[PDB]
């Protein structure tokens, strides 16, 4: 609703802890140093809720991180901000909650916002390095929910750790990053990424977790190839279709048997190139009359490195396989310390359709209203 605003400003925000004391970060004046990994969910009231890692001290992934949330009830013009999930505070250099994935769903009639983040405390290396234990003793994946339109969040006591432990071949699991979905039948679905135990040949795989009530979750029996593992799933005709990060060309598979087997999905497979290393990207579907169109955001990465420039919006014709660049919304080189991530959000409330994007911009998280592009996108089918 505003065309563009700063949600969280690098070296310009101050948060308080659970006791009311300010969190003294490494930015100027003791502010939070950097923000990364934005996830956005819009409610039926039109409220925009944005989550992101508040990396207080450094952009580094192995550092002190809390999950910040920002809410706007005026179309993205102003934001009310606070911490939604605090890390455990076991280790002041490394305790962290990170990489949010959110869902906005009607669960049994109650509109709920779910946010899932991974949690670590003493691990000093990247998650992929811990493959001995099933699962890693330092790891956890926590789920919080809001049933009051994003004002308050509370932990959900779930069976996720149990399901992972029962499987016996997973060291750690994380959400796909960005947003998950509620299927036409009502089930909640979070795309996930996992690190397998040392015995498995494939270090990483992609899959999903599903639930009808948000409390008991299940993992399907099969697995999809990992690639760069961050991914999103869309529902198209009784198939679930994912769109996965990959260095070079992005990948896309479909499951017609609810997670047991996956085959390449031609309309979206290898259609967008993010260049060296790959980047997370956001994929959602938009209805157009009786059909569907997929909208996707990711970086063009013109420098072919970690600067991940030119974060853009693409439309994918799910019928013909055609792809078109709709708009290069952040046609700038990003900060190599951490850049290029994004999250799209589409909603039609009553008769009002909005398409919004949140993305990484030099340590800050920016917002843009892309609704103007809706007719062009909607024509792609």
Swiss-Prot record:
Domain of life the protein comes from: Bacteria
EC assignment: 3.2.1.18
Organism field: Salmonella typhimurium (strain LT2 / SGSC1412 / ATCC 700720)
EC supergroup of this enzyme: hydrolase
Ranges of the BNR repeats in the UniProt entry: 70-81, 144-155, 209-219, 253-264
Summary of subunit composition and partner proteins: Monomer.
BP terms from Gene Ontology: ganglioside catabolic process; oligosaccharide catabolic process
InterPro entries: Sialidase, Sialidase_fam, Sialidase_sf, Sialidase_trypan
Encoding gene per record: nanH
A GO MF term: exo-alpha-sialidase activity
Alphabetical keyword list: Disulfide bond, Glycosidase, Hydrolase, Repeat
GO cellular component terms, semicolon-separated: cytoplasm; intracellular membrane-bounded organelle; membrane
Catalytic residues as annotated in Swiss-Prot or TrEMBL: 61 (proton acceptor), 341 (nucleophile), 360
Residue numbers binding substrate: 36, 245, 308
Name by which UniProt lists this protein: Sialidase
Function of the protein: Cleaves the terminal sialic acid (N-acetyl neuraminic acid) from carbohydrate chains in glycoproteins providing free sialic acid which can be used as carbon and energy sources. Sialidases have been suggested to be pathogenic factors in microbial infections.
Family of this protein: Belongs to the glycosyl hydrolase 33 family.
Record-annotated disulphide pairs: 41-102
Catalytic reactions of this protein: Hydrolysis of alpha-(2->3)-, alpha-(2->6)-, alpha-(2->8)- glycosidic linkages of terminal sialic acid residues in oligosaccharides, glycoproteins, glycolipids, colominic acid and synthetic substrates
């Amino acid at each position: 609703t505003v065309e563009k605003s700063v949600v969280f400003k690098a070296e310009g925000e101050h948060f308080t802890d659970q006791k009311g004391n300010t969190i003294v970060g490494s930015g100027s004046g003791g502010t939070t140093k950097y923000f990364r990994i934005p996830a956005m969910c819009t409610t039926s009231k039109g409220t925009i809720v944005v989550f992101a890692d508040a990396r207080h001290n450094t952009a580094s992934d192995q550092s002190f991180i809390d999950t910040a949330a920002a809410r706007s009830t005026d179309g993205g013009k102003t934001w009310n901000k606070k911490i939604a999930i605090y890390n455990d505070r076991v280790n002041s250099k490394l305790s962290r909650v990170m990489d949010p994935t959110c869902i906005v769903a009607n669960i049994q009639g109650r509109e709920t916002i779910l946010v899932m983040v991974g949690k670590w405390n003493n691990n000093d290396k990247t998650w992929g390095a811990y493959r001995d234990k099933a699962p890693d003793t330092d790891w956890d994946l926590v789920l919080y929910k809001s049933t009051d339109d994003g004002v308050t969040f509370s932990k959900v006591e779930t069976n996720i750790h149990d399901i992972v432990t029962k499987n016996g071949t997973i060291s750690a699991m994380l959400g796909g990053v960005g947003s998950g979905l509620q299927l036409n039948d009502g089930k909640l679905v979070f795309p996930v990424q996992m690190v397998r135990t040392k015995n498995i040949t494939t270090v990483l795989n992609t899959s999903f977790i599903y639930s009808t009530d948000g409390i008991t979750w299940s993992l399907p029996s099969g697995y999809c190839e990992g690639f760069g593992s961050e991914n999103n799933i869309i529902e198209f005709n009784a198939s679930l279709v994912n769109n996965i990060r990959n260095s070079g060309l992005r990948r896309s598979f479909e499951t017609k048997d609810f997670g047991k087997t996956w085959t390449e999905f031609p309309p979206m497979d290898k259609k967008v190139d993010n260049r060296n290393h790959g980047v997370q990207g956001s994929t959602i579907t938009i209805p157009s009359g009786n059909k569907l169109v997929a909208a996707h955001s990711s970086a063009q990465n013109k420098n072919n490195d970690y600067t991940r420039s030119d974060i853009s919006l693409y439309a994918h014709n799910l019928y013909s396989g055609e792809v078109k660049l709709i708009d290069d919304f952040y046609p700038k080189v990003g900060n190599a310390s951490g850049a290029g991530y994004s999250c799209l959000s589409y909603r039609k409330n009553v008769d009002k359709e909005t398409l919004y994007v949140v993305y990484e911009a030099n340590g800050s998280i920016e917002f843009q209203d892309l609704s103007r592009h809706l007719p062009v996108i909607k024509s792609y089918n």
